Design an enzyme around this catalytic site. Structure first.
Site, PDB file in Angstrom:
ATOM      1  N   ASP B 189      -7.385  28.343  29.659  1.00  0.00           N
ATOM      2  CA  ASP B 189      -6.914  26.779  29.454  1.00  0.00           C
ATOM      3  C   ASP B 189      -7.669  25.971  29.802  1.00  0.00           C
ATOM      4  O   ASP B 189      -7.866  24.956  30.862  1.00  0.00           O
ATOM      5  CB  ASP B 189      -5.763  26.955  30.797  1.00  0.00           C
ATOM      6  CG  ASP B 189      -5.073  25.654  31.168  1.00  0.00           C
ATOM      7  OD1 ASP B 189      -4.523  25.109  30.119  1.00  0.00           O
ATOM      8  OD2 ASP B 189      -4.869  25.589  32.481  1.00  0.00           O
ATOM      9  N   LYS B 191      -9.004  21.921  28.773  1.00  0.00           N
ATOM     10  CA  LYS B 191      -8.253  20.922  28.785  1.00  0.00           C
ATOM     11  C   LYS B 191      -8.883  19.658  29.338  1.00  0.00           C
ATOM     12  O   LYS B 191      -9.543  19.663  30.066  1.00  0.00           O
ATOM     13  CB  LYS B 191      -6.559  20.808  29.043  1.00  0.00           C
ATOM     14  CG  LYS B 191      -6.359  21.194  30.486  1.00  0.00           C
ATOM     15  CD  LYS B 191      -5.041  21.330  31.007  1.00  0.00           C
ATOM     16  CE  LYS B 191      -4.767  21.365  32.197  1.00  0.00           C
ATOM     17  NZ  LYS B 191      -3.148  21.882  32.456  1.00  0.00           N
ATOM     18  N   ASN B 194      -9.090  19.311  32.872  1.00  0.00           N
ATOM     19  CA  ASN B 194     -10.292  20.191  33.750  1.00  0.00           C
ATOM     20  C   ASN B 194     -11.690  19.737  33.566  1.00  0.00           C
ATOM     21  O   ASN B 194     -12.593  20.533  34.094  1.00  0.00           O
ATOM     22  CB  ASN B 194      -9.810  21.644  33.016  1.00  0.00           C
ATOM     23  CG  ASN B 194      -8.617  22.126  33.341  1.00  0.00           C
ATOM     24  OD1 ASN B 194      -7.882  21.582  34.412  1.00  0.00           O
ATOM     25  ND2 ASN B 194      -8.076  23.133  32.420  1.00  0.00           N
ATOM     26  N   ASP B 207     -10.620  23.390  38.262  1.00  0.00           N
ATOM     27  CA  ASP B 207      -9.356  23.959  38.404  1.00  0.00           C
ATOM     28  C   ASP B 207      -9.456  25.339  37.505  1.00  0.00           C
ATOM     29  O   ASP B 207      -9.104  25.208  36.344  1.00  0.00           O
ATOM     30  CB  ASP B 207      -8.437  22.886  37.767  1.00  0.00           C
ATOM     31  CG  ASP B 207      -6.766  23.383  37.910  1.00  0.00           C
ATOM     32  OD1 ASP B 207      -6.407  24.547  38.356  1.00  0.00           O
ATOM     33  OD2 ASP B 207      -5.988  22.787  37.190  1.00  0.00           O
ATOM     34  N   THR B 228      -2.022  25.704  28.421  1.00  0.00           N
ATOM     35  CA  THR B 228      -1.215  24.292  28.377  1.00  0.00           C
ATOM     36  C   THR B 228      -0.537  24.367  26.905  1.00  0.00           C
ATOM     37  O   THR B 228      -1.097  25.006  25.812  1.00  0.00           O
ATOM     38  CB  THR B 228      -1.705  23.326  28.384  1.00  0.00           C
ATOM     39  OG1 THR B 228      -2.358  23.113  30.176  1.00  0.00           O
ATOM     40  CG2 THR B 228      -1.301  21.863  28.335  1.00  0.00           C
TER      41      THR B 228
HETATM   42  C1  LIG Z   1      -3.120  25.369  41.766  1.00  0.00           C
HETATM   43  O1  LIG Z   1      -2.151  24.007  41.828  1.00  0.00           O
HETATM   44  C2  LIG Z   1      -2.847  22.737  42.055  1.00  0.00           C
HETATM   45  C3  LIG Z   1      -2.504  22.287  43.338  1.00  0.00           C
HETATM   46  C4  LIG Z   1      -3.411  21.139  43.610  1.00  0.00           C
HETATM   47  C5  LIG Z   1      -3.882  20.321  42.928  1.00  0.00           C
HETATM   48  C6  LIG Z   1      -3.946  20.795  41.529  1.00  0.00           C
HETATM   49  C7  LIG Z   1      -4.737  20.131  40.511  1.00  0.00           C
HETATM   50  C8  LIG Z   1      -6.479  20.427  40.605  1.00  0.00           C
HETATM   51  O2  LIG Z   1      -6.627  21.728  40.052  1.00  0.00           O
HETATM   52  N1  LIG Z   1      -7.293  19.796  40.991  1.00  0.00           N
HETATM   53  C9  LIG Z   1      -8.714  19.637  41.135  1.00  0.00           C
HETATM   54  N2  LIG Z   1      -9.384  18.845  41.325  1.00  0.00           N
HETATM   55  C10 LIG Z   1     -10.676  19.040  41.654  1.00  0.00           C
HETATM   56  C11 LIG Z   1     -11.436  18.040  41.998  1.00  0.00           C
HETATM   57  C12 LIG Z   1     -12.945  18.513  42.191  1.00  0.00           C
HETATM   58  C13 LIG Z   1     -13.880  17.591  42.544  1.00  0.00           C
HETATM   59  N3  LIG Z   1     -13.662  16.203  42.441  1.00  0.00           N
HETATM   60  C14 LIG Z   1     -12.508  15.838  42.299  1.00  0.00           C
HETATM   61  N4  LIG Z   1     -12.282  14.563  42.236  1.00  0.00           N
HETATM   62  C15 LIG Z   1     -11.295  16.679  42.016  1.00  0.00           C
HETATM   63  C16 LIG Z   1     -10.807  20.390  41.409  1.00  0.00           C
HETATM   64  S1  LIG Z   1      -9.614  21.245  41.075  1.00  0.00           S
HETATM   65  C17 LIG Z   1      -3.453  22.195  41.048  1.00  0.00           C
END
Ligand SMILES: COc1cccc(CC(=O)Nc2nc(-c3ccnc(N)c3)cs2)c1
Ligand SMILES: COc1cccc(CC(=O)Nc2nc(-c3ccnc(N)c3)cs2)c1
Lengths: 386, 387
Positions: B189, B191, B194, B207, B228
């Site tokens: 996935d 995108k 990510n 992610d 997606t």
């Molecule tokens: C699995 O279901 C969910 C649950 C909650 C959020 C999400 C979106 C998601 O995966 N966001 C990510 N953000 C980061 C991240 C790393 C470093 N710095 C910044 N600013 C963001 C890594 S993975 C999916």
């Protein structure tokens, strides 16, 4: 505290032999959970099934690596008790010789008694006294508890008393050693409650060591303890323990041992168990000595000093007032160098596995329909020495 | 030998990759206590006596080990399916991290294992780094390094992307996907959501939900579709026995969107997009745009074909050799050392300008043993970690 502090604190806790959350206590937790969950009824729950499947290969590796009963060659059954047997063993790898006490998990649960061993473990594991039998390893499985101790080749005081008319010189030595040893236990904040000749063992040199810490208990801030449990054989127990107190109770038993050594019989013996209890409660009139000049003035005095109501019992004020008693006045030993003197009976032993002083000597849990947690009262019993 | 058995058993309690290291074992006790502290179950003496015995201890343990109240939450910098991501400050160290939370109840009502693993041991400048992973009775926590530059969705939404930039961002995606593939994983996935940007404006993948381990033939056998709706390759869409070629289809979709402004198979309804994907042979068209270069179009079409003729079927090097990447500003071997096309201007260690302004249900009390905390035993990464 700081970040590092909290980490380092937690890290040390995994390494502490006195910790409840040591690497070993934690392995017991997993081993238990897996034993109490591997049933078809419970496996219908996916959380339970998936967990078990996931930890299959791993739980097995551990079960094979960790200390197990098949690591020892059994040489002889040197004893028997309520919930198990004691046996002379040889660790197959090291070839080292030990005494191993076994405790039945099923029986302990059935008979509702499943917490005494804790006191017995800590005492033997951490006492580090020449007066206490040393625990080297403690382990388990779904069926038994195991206590690997140093073997006492000289036998118990029951065997000694049964083979000799004990002279007063000897009775003084053995009483004194009991006094020093009971004091060591008391100094660890423990009360024995049922001191008997069966609990008094002899090392290769003929010196005393206490064993079988079943009835032992930790004292409170006031050096006191509370209970209401089933009395075994009343013969050696203090009146106040039967009436149910502090460490004065252990001194009552010393007087009973000193009586038995010199008289030949226990002071409150009667046909039935209930009979013995009656004689104890009525000590004031039941305690009598036979009409043979044999027992000395001081021997009689010390016996009566211990065989009184707690309030006037020799020992109420502390060990030193017992030590000062004239019965112990002698020209052979000092209290401070006694276990360095020559014992009155030195065992002549043929080998490292000589068992001459020892007399010549299976229901399991059903399958549960729901979670029962039969292994839970034993999590953390494990112990290894380094 | 005796010593051998000790040593063996001893390397097992210490290994960060072991199933029975201090981290997992502590989780096992913490779980048992959570799933047993109910009045229904406490009627069983074994259960009651156990809980009472381990009360004072379990508490000390809970207070010492990493907990959510050890962090000061600065802002909710994201939301997803099973939780939220938040900018936090560890109260003691005063250090700043992005923390992804996962609802234990919602998840039940096992992807996180692959995600935890990749971030903790990837040791690549292309992968977002996991520092700590802790839990409780309600959530999973992933303490990662904060990416202040935001995602590619935000970039694409604030700039008409020039070809120079699109080359840079594609190349960095190519290097990063290759790093994951080299760890034996299909991304599944890929995108813009990510694709994240560090303080220097360089790419990192985040992610890793859909990540799966390839077999001996470097293949994955999935009976159901994953990804997606706009980036999903025709072969994943009809799943199923496929390989890493699928990630290269998505790079094509990502290249086309950055240059064209819309996705190549966009349609009114979601079902519409699926139809256009299955008919990539005739649906893929470019507008009258006097700016999409000959090579940009060539690379897009090279990736947006059936797997059998897809650029990448033979390996990364055949993608790297493509003329679209021919330039006089960077070499593939020194790209993440070059100056990024957009360098984030940041006000602080907690600047959250690249993140849009953003603003609970649990398991019922069980009548019998349910073991709801059992699918999470061992998720902790704190006591036993790789340095
Ligand atoms: C699995 O279901 C969910 C649950 C909650 C959020 C999400 C979106 C998601 O995966 N966001 C990510 N953000 C980061 C991240 C790393 C470093 N710095 C910044 N600013 C963001 C890594 S993975 C999916
Ligand atoms: C409470 O349940 C049971 C179960 C089985 C046996 C018993 C009697 C008992 O406690 N014997 C002991 N023997 C030793 C022991 C140490 C060193 N050497 C030698 N020879 C014996 C320590 S405790 C009680």
């Amino acid at each position: 505290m700081s970040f590092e502090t909290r980490f380092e604190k937690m890290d040390n806790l995994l390494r502490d032999p006195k910790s409840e959350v040591n690497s070993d206590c934690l392995l017991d937790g997993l081993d238990a959970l897996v034993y109490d969950l591997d049933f078809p009824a419970l496996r219908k729950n996916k959380n339970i099934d998936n967990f078990l499947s996931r930890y299959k290969d791993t739980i097995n590796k551990i079960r094979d690596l960790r200390m197990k009963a098949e690591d020892y060659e059994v040489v002889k059954v040197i004893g028997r008790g309520a919930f198990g047997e004691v046996q002379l063993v040889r660790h197959k790898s090291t070839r080292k010789v030990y005494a191993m006490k076994l405790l039945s998990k099923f029986e302990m649960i059935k008979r509702s008694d499943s917490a005494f061993f804790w006191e017995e473990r800590d005492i033997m594991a951490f006492a580090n006294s020449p007066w206490v039998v040393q625990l080297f390893y403690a382990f388990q499985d779904d069926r038994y508890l195991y206590m690997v101790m140093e073997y006492m080749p000289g036998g118990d005081l029951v065997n000694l008393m049964s083979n000799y008319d004990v002279p007063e010189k000897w009775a003084r030595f053995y009483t004194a050693e009991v006094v020093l040893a009971l004091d060591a236990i008391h100094s660890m904040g423990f009360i024995h409650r049922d001191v008997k000749p069966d609990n008094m063992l002899l090392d290769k040199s003929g010196h005393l060591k206490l064993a079988d810490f079943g009835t032992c208990m930790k004292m409170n801030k006031e050096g006191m303890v509370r209970c209401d449990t089933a009395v075994g054989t009343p013969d050696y127990i203090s009146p106040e323990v039967l009436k149910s107190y502090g460490r004065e109770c252990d001194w009552w038993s010393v007087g009973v041992f000193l009586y038995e050594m010199l008289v030949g019989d226990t002071p409150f013996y009667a046909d039935s168990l209930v009979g013995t209890y009656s004689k104890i409660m009525n000590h004031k009139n039941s305690l009598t000595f036979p009409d043979d000049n044999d027992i000395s003035k001081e021997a009689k005095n010390l016996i009566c000093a211990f065989l009184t109501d707690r309030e006037v019992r020799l020992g109420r004020n502390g060990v030193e007032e017992i030590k000062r008693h004239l019965f112990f006045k002698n020209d052979q030993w000092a209290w401070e160098t006694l276990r360095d003197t020559v014992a009155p009976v030195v065992p002549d032993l043929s080998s490292d596995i000589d068992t001459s002083n020892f007399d010549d000597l299976e229901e399991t849990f059903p399958i549960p329909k729901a979670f029962v947690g039969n292994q839970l009262p034993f999590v953390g019993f494990t112990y290894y020495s380094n």
